[PDB]
Amino acid sequence: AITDILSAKDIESALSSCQAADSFNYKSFFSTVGLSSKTPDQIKKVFGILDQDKSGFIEEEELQLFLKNFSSSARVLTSAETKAFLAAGDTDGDGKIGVEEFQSLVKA
Template identity: 35%
Template sequence: MARRVSQISAHETVVIPNDLTDEQFEEIKESFHKIDLNGDGRLSRRELMKAAAILGMNPTDKDIDAMMKDVDKNNDGFISFKEYLKIMQDNYKEVDLEKERMKAAFRYIDKDNDGFLTLKELKTILSHNNSGISDPEIEQFFKQIDTDGDGKIDYEEFIESDLCSAVF
């Protein structure tokens, strides 16, 4: 497989990891440049705090210290693009694992493998797990998840709901 390389700045080139698509890599690169307010090619504690605030988070100094300790592998007090790339690459892997877990849960409930969950399948799984949820509660839950009202839950409706965490 050919190595994919990207120019990050006038002074830095990086090999794009094989497990990232070009689109994912570009998202990571773009987010890094948005956080790098002074454009020096590295992220400071101050820039991380501002980025967190923009995202609606309110990390403490202790939170930022922990992040810096985890990500700043060369201990220079900054997060380089390569360090940022590594942590974001790991985040993409975690998202992929979560998607696989959701697909497996859906397939587990979908006993007839038709790509949809019926009320009967939902009742079977919730009864089997001794959830203590009554039939009327299950029916109400089903109606809330079945957003298009077609009497069955497709995968998109499933992942948008809390059904997976309720079942497993």
């Protein structure tokens, strides 16, 4: 579970911050839930959850459902938010986010 590594309380605070459409920013969310200080294994576990269909990569539609991993009532990210998110993380430009890229994003 995601709460195996992250505090439900931190998650609540991160979600309340980005309730408005187009308010989302991965750097703010990542710090509020406390991803920045996690180890490779912990980051890999979080990645595995975000990779909802277990394909090994986080594709665009999964970035769309980014908040849904933290709360089933959370909103879907907008196309703009998703586009910017993917733009930030997709280093090699294959259109998706792999574990190495996710790690880099967390430790940036």
